[PDB]
Amino acid sequence: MQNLEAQVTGSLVAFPDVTQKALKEDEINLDSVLRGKFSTGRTSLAWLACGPQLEITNSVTGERISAYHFSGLTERPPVVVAVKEFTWQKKTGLLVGLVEAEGSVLCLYDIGISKVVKAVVLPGSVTAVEPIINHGGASASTQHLHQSLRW
Amino acid sequence: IKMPPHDMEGLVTIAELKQSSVMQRLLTGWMPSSIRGDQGPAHLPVSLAVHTLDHDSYLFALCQDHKLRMWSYKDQMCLMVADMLEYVPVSKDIRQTAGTGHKLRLAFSETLGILYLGV
Chain A: nearest CA to B81, how far in angstroms?
23
Query: Which chain B residues have a beta carbon less than 8 Å from that of A18?
Result: 89, 91
Read off the amino acid at residue A23. Answer: L
Question: Which distant-in-sequence residues (6+ apart) come within 8 Å of A51 by Cβ?
Answer: A26, A29, A32, A77, A79, A80
What residue type is assigned to position A123 of the chain? P
Residue B98 C-alpha, separation from nearest chain A C-alpha, in angstroms: 18
* Gap from B88 CA to chain A (nearest CA, Å): 10
Cα separations in angstroms, A89 against A86, A109, A135, B73, B118: 10, 14, 8, 45, 27
Considering only CB atoms, B91 lies closest to which of A21, A67, A69, namely A21
In sequence order, what are the beta bridge partners of A87? A92
Rounded to whole angstroms, the Cα distance separating A136 from A142 reads 7
Q: What was the resolution (in A) of this experimentally determined structure?
A: 5.6
- Within 8 A by CB and 6+ apart from B78, the residues are B17, B19, B69, B70, B71
What is the phi/psi pair of residue A48, to 5°? -125, 140
Residue of A nearest to B94 (CA): A18
This structure was determined by cryo-EM
CA distances for B116 relative to A54, A106, B57, B66, angstroms: 29, 32, 15, 19
Residue B89 at interface with chain A, using a CB cutoff of 8 Å:
yes
d(CA A115, CA A109): 6
